[PDB]
């Protein structure tokens, strides 16, 4: 300012506005706190859900599609002992789909080589990794892990 | 389904941005360990709305906070200068103005 | 009662058959079909179900007798958030031009309906009647950017209505809407900051930020934030 009344005008204009802006800053920061707490309470489940949906869509993109048949075609490797449980998972999926007419799980004569699986446990994981470090054993050859 | 994959990546970007802001903030992330299998019905749209709104409001408040901070600090300094100016005139107050 | 998939599909098929005609379309509005089918179109994802709801909506908008009648149906749909799921289905693709045409028709007509709702005359009518209840014009930025000056007509009659409601309103919805509209007026007519100062909207929103309702506080805080952005 240049004059006493100008000085008083500016002084009042800033004295109201500073308190107003501090008030809004503090309340909006409290709003940040509330909404960010609400987000953090659930983000992990949100992360898991979005990642699961991503995985589901990506794996679905491996099937053959309406270009071949309106129903999808897929192919899987599985341990034999769990065929019943896999069919039960298929049953669960169809139940969630709500269709009366059911799905089907099919065996077939195969030319591709089976993978190797070991049903590792907490104690033997390190040793199984140690023997895997030099090449995984062929289907059903003796595992050096239990002796190592 | 790659389009749905792209939508999931947009969702993951939203969530990771919010997670980074949470890390920058002091509030903890909870580690409850809930592991549901996501259903088929379009919960995706509800979750997209929720993530979009959460991240959008976070962005808007974050941006507005800086401007309010700047203006408040400017007005504080102006108040201080206005205070000291009269002391600088403190000699003899005969004139009406 | 949420019957099975086939029963739902057949019942919406019935609705589509009825909607093929103007008179029955006009008289069966009383059952508020649109919201229930809006939720069902997301829950009952089955393509037959989705297609038949979209076809029923298309028939409704086709055979509604008046422009106003089609506008009630479209306004109900937008209030029930049909348009966003129409966008999502547009992102999606299906194996016939029929679903494509249904989606495109509903999309274009929803766009036209929101454009009609965005009329500044209808905004004036809503303000005059006090129906500050989140009509799409309120969140249509296109209306605001162009018409924010027009609120100054009749010696700022619309702004006076808004500011008067910002002290008279006990209704949370009306009060929050008025606060948000003051914020938008600030956002889209920069010269109006002195006008709102003169009308007291500045102080009214600064007070309603402390309102007892979370939504009123939220909107008032938004508006006051937009207010203090500049010296």
Curated annotation (Swiss-Prot), chain B:
Q: Which residues form a coiled coil?
A: none
Q: Where is this protein found?
A: Cytoplasmic vesicle, Clathrin-coated vesicle membrane; Cytoplasmic vesicle, Secretory vesicle, Synaptic vesicle membrane; Melanosome
Q: Which domain of life is it from?
A: Eukaryota
Question: Which cysteine pairs are covalently linked by disulfides here?
Answer: none
Biological role: Subunit of the V0 complex of vacuolar(H+)-ATPase (V-ATPase), a multisubunit enzyme composed of a peripheral complex (V1) that hydrolyzes ATP and a membrane integral complex (V0) that translocates protons. V-ATPase is responsible for the acidification of various organelles, such as lysosomes, endosomes, the trans-Golgi network, and secretory granules, including synaptic vesicles. In certain cell types, can be exported to the plasma membrane, where it is involved in the acidification of the extracellular environment. Required for assembly and activity of the vacuolar ATPase.
Quaternary structure and interacting proteins, as annotated: V-ATPase is a heteromultimeric enzyme made up of two complexes: the ATP-hydrolytic V1 complex and the proton translocation V0 complex. The V1 complex consists of three catalytic AB heterodimers that form a heterohexamer, three peripheral stalks each consisting of EG heterodimers, one central rotor including subunits D and F, and the regulatory subunits C and H. The proton translocation complex V0 consists of the proton transport subunit a, a ring of proteolipid subunits c9c'', rotary subunit d, subunits e and f, and the accessory subunits ATP6AP1/Ac45 and ATP6AP2/PRR. Interacts with SPAAR.
What family does this belong to?
Belongs to the V-ATPase 116 kDa subunit family.
Q: What is the name listed in the Swiss-Prot or TrEMBL entry for this protein? A: V-type proton ATPase 116 kDa subunit a 1
